[PDB]
Scaffold this active site. Structure first.
Site, short mmCIF file in Angstrom:
data_model
loop_
_atom_site.label_atom_id
_atom_site.label_comp_id
_atom_site.label_asym_id
_atom_site.label_seq_id
_atom_site.Cartn_x
_atom_site.Cartn_y
_atom_site.Cartn_z
N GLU B 26 47.20 54.18 -32.40
CA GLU B 26 47.09 52.73 -32.42
C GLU B 26 48.44 52.00 -32.47
O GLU B 26 49.47 52.58 -32.82
CB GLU B 26 46.24 52.29 -33.61
CG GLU B 26 46.87 52.69 -34.92
CD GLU B 26 46.30 51.93 -36.08
OE1 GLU B 26 46.82 50.83 -36.37
OE2 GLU B 26 45.33 52.41 -36.70
N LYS B 88 46.88 40.68 -33.41
CA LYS B 88 46.11 41.82 -33.90
C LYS B 88 44.77 41.81 -33.17
O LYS B 88 44.06 40.81 -33.19
CB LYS B 88 45.90 41.74 -35.41
CG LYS B 88 44.76 42.62 -35.94
CD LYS B 88 44.71 42.57 -37.47
CE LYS B 88 43.40 43.15 -37.99
NZ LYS B 88 43.34 43.26 -39.48
N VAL B 108 41.86 50.14 -35.15
CA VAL B 108 41.12 51.38 -34.92
C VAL B 108 39.96 51.14 -33.95
O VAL B 108 39.77 51.89 -33.01
CB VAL B 108 40.59 51.98 -36.24
CG1 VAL B 108 39.44 52.94 -35.97
CG2 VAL B 108 41.72 52.68 -37.00
N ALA B 143 35.13 45.81 -38.31
CA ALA B 143 34.50 46.21 -37.06
C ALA B 143 34.80 47.68 -36.74
O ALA B 143 34.16 48.28 -35.87
CB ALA B 143 34.93 45.30 -35.89
N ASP B 144 35.76 48.28 -37.45
CA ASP B 144 36.02 49.72 -37.31
C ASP B 144 34.74 50.55 -37.57
O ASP B 144 34.51 51.55 -36.91
CB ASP B 144 37.12 50.22 -38.27
CG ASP B 144 38.52 49.69 -37.92
OD1 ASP B 144 38.68 48.99 -36.90
OD2 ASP B 144 39.48 50.00 -38.69
N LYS B 161 41.56 52.91 -45.92
CA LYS B 161 42.69 52.37 -46.66
C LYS B 161 42.18 51.99 -48.04
O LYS B 161 41.06 51.50 -48.17
CB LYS B 161 43.26 51.14 -45.96
CG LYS B 161 43.78 51.42 -44.55
CD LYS B 161 44.18 50.13 -43.85
CE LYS B 161 45.10 50.40 -42.67
NZ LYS B 161 44.39 50.29 -41.37
C1 R5P Z 1 44.68 49.78 -40.36
C2 R5P Z 1 43.84 50.01 -39.12
O1 R5P Z 1 44.54 49.59 -37.93
C3 R5P Z 1 42.52 49.23 -39.14
O2 R5P Z 1 41.91 49.37 -37.85
C4 R5P Z 1 42.66 47.74 -39.42
O3 R5P Z 1 43.17 47.52 -40.74
C5 R5P Z 1 41.30 47.03 -39.34
O4 R5P Z 1 41.46 45.63 -39.60
P1 R5P Z 1 40.17 44.66 -39.59
O5 R5P Z 1 39.83 44.60 -38.12
O6 R5P Z 1 39.11 45.35 -40.43
O7 R5P Z 1 40.65 43.38 -40.22
#
Ligand code: R5P
Ligand code: R5P
Ligand code: R5P
Ligand code: MN
Ligand code: MN
Ligand code: MN
Lengths: 305, 307, 307
Positions: B26, B88, B108, B143-144, B161
């Site tokens: 990523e 992001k 992710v 959404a992960d 995390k």
């Molecule tokens: C840390 C990792 O990249 C993870 O996908 C993101 O923290 C997800 O962020 P969010 O889309 O849940 O705000």
């Protein structure tokens, strides 16, 4: 590939699709769950789309048949039969069709039939969503799941103001559904023009919406889009007034145990009498306002093939 | 799909044609996840770690509106330099960054999507998004989790995390039928820490068993991804009481300041680094190398079976 | 077209499917986990007989030596019944690993639906489905059965959701995910041991013919997902409302006090309820399984007539 016994696409819509003209779907639930303002306001919605240079398709179940685009008599049938017409979401759909009944389609179910017919653009007043108290009651509209899975752009005033908009915005993100503010960062509040809440992205033109639709589906990201189109400032309800009525209507539904599919119709009907019918008036206007934008989106998308 | 939308680098293309194992990476960890230079240089080192393990790295991002599978050093630097200027990008954001010709750093969820489009089945990261603290009230849920439910990619991480709610996250994965594989652990690792009060769904002791389960899962038509939780190496782990204090304070502060949405995680990780004097960051870096190593073995073992 | 190494259908079942005879699928979790030995295998064997007496062909489903099996011998049934809790309880998330490692497993509603769908079986009889657990608005404990009902095309005939669950929340959850909850000759959702409850089904249907027709329309209309048919326990086999509810409430408070969580919950609760009711809850449970198998067979015959 579906049987004609199950699904019938009207001559005008079938032709509009043949000739690659912009088509905009409409839902039938709004026009069951208030005569005459019911069947009349639906007829004008279509004309509004026609004057925009687009083709209306109003969607309903009639005689157990899923129909894409209706006739004046059919519209009239749905408007007068009123609450006697079954409210149809995804879980309801197979039974009305099987039993040859009439039904009025919610956003979830209207999306389904639109998709079957190849219609990418859909205009309504407001989408269902997460209800207040849902963190406890789990009352969450099937509309949100449909939005997650089915490729159709729904043009609305945001979520219906009776819902929990903050929970709704989180829910949409979780399920990957774009919440597009039209010329707005702030999420439109249905009756109210803004909210304490933000959309996922602001786009300033129908063409940019259509272009994103094309990218989204060409990349295989299935599911729909919410275009939140704020209500004209002149047709808006005053914040303290609209929200006091809503708060009271919500609270009354709790005392009285209104639950399930009857909640939304109950709340809106209450709010309409608590405002003396002023809320209804605003509801009619945002519908027109959405049908116009929806028409622009539809033609831009047609351009982009 | 169109090369206007999706571009795979020659290194990655050669790997897929020649059936060499590929590991996706990523870009959100490069821009929003850490600071510069620690972002660009680390991202480069991760790629090198994978290469040294005998696999082929593919860092994924959106560059100038194009979904890119594999990135040049130049592109990595760009994302690292631009930093928080870079959007992001989760599932819902993806169509707009591509349409508007912009840069984006993929989460992710987004990385899985793009990897799958490329036919890449293994993806290494620091930690997945998850159910947030307070989400039973706020509905803030990454959404992960929905991507893992529906997209066929194995994601190698140090667990979710640990700024999140791990218990609720493990229930959620179960409901959505996502395997949570402990690698040589039954206890669910919690990012910076090796253990937690919670369990993975199954412990597996080798990359070989993981790859076998992937083939079986997907040949049986069970769509969706797999979480492989890989504990941080002992030498880089952080003391429970110390990291849990910094996290609790960061969370309490986010709520007091009304932090919400996609800004939550970046805000929290940044505050934790502050409070730990940069140590959480040092650990985050080491756990990413560790996952890249394990991911490389899984890709090797999967590619051996697959094609 | 699944590898014969992963999936094996019994010669009888395969013959029935080819000749378009009605087939009813059965789960194995009720054998190993839901009920004690000998009463578990005895029940499972007599269920198959019941289906045969109704003019249909039973197919019990389990994982045997790493193979997903559709149709089982009496010994295999008895092995599953004797080995008991030594057999892995297998939901969607567990399925790939038991198959991969060559182990035995007893399938929940979720994994049974999966396997049935692979075999082309549209009708599945069980006791009661998983659902939303009490306290789930806090714990997030929500059965993967509900997600499977959301996405897999199988009609599940049950006595409702097991009443150890939170039925209100389960009814809301099913609606969100677009899943019909059909009352067979009932408006009120039956609760497992009890004929009625405070909750209503999505639609009341009075014949197996009506259910079969709805199934054809649903799937020909491309609305993927399953259907719950809730079939009230016959009145004479019903538990006294006050007695069964005191038993469940206590078992639930005990599971919470003892920190029982996850996949061990349901089997812990049912076992504790049987203990508290002196085996009476088990007797009701056995009868409702018989009664569901009867209705399931009629549904299968009708569906076969239409499809
Ligand atoms: C840390 C990792 O990249 C993870 O996908 C993101 O923290 C997800 O962020 P969010 O889309 O849940 O705000
Ligand atoms: C208002 C619009 O028709 C919307 O789709 C419905 O109110 C949804 O109602 P429900 O199915 O969420 O109760
Ligand atoms: C009782 C029935 O088999 C049901 O599917 C299981 O008990 C569900 O168990 P869980 O997966 O919800 O723990
Ligand atoms: Mn509802
Ligand atoms: Mn979030
Ligand atoms: Mn559970």
């Amino acid at each position: 590939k579906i049987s004609p016994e199950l699904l019938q696409i009207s001559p005008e819509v079938q032709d509009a699709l043949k000739n690659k003209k912009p088509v905009v779907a409409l839902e039938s639930t709004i026009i069951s769950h208030p005569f005459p303002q019911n069947a009349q306001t639906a007829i004008e919605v279509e004309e509004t789309i026609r004057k925009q240079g687009a083709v209306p398709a109003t969607i309903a179940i009639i005689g157990g048949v899923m129909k894409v685009g209706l006739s004046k008599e059919e519209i009239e049938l749905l408007g007068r039969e009123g609450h006697n017409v079954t409210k149809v979401s995804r879980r309801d759909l197979p039974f009305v069709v099987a039993a040859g009944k009439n039904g009025a389609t919610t956003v979830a179910s209207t999306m389904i039939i639109a998709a079957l017919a190849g219609i990418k653009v859909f205009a309504t007043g407001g989408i269902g969503g997460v209800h207040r108290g849902a963190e406890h009651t789990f009352d969450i509209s099937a509309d949100l799941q449909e939005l997650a899975n089915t490729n159709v752009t729904v043009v609305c005033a945001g979520a219906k103001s009776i819902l929990d908009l903050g929970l709704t915005t989180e829910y949409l993100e979780t399920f990957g559904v774009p919440l597009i503010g039209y010329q707005t960062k702030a999420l439109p509040a249905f009756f109210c023009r803004t909210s304490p809440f933000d959309v996922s992205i602001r786009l300033d033109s129908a063409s940019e919406i259509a272009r994103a639709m094309v990218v989204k589906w060409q990349s295989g990201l299935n599911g729909g889009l919410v275009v939140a189109n704020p209500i004209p400032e002149q047709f808006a309800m005053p914040e303290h007034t609209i929200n006091a009525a809503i708060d009271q209507a919500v609270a009354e539904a709790e005392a009285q145990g209104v639950i399930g599919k009857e909640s939304t119709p109950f709340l809106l009907a209450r709010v309409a009498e608590l405002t003396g019918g002023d809320s209804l008036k605003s509801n009619i206007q945002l519908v027109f306002n959405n049908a116009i934008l929806a028409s622009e989106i539809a033609k831009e998308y047609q351009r982009l093939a």
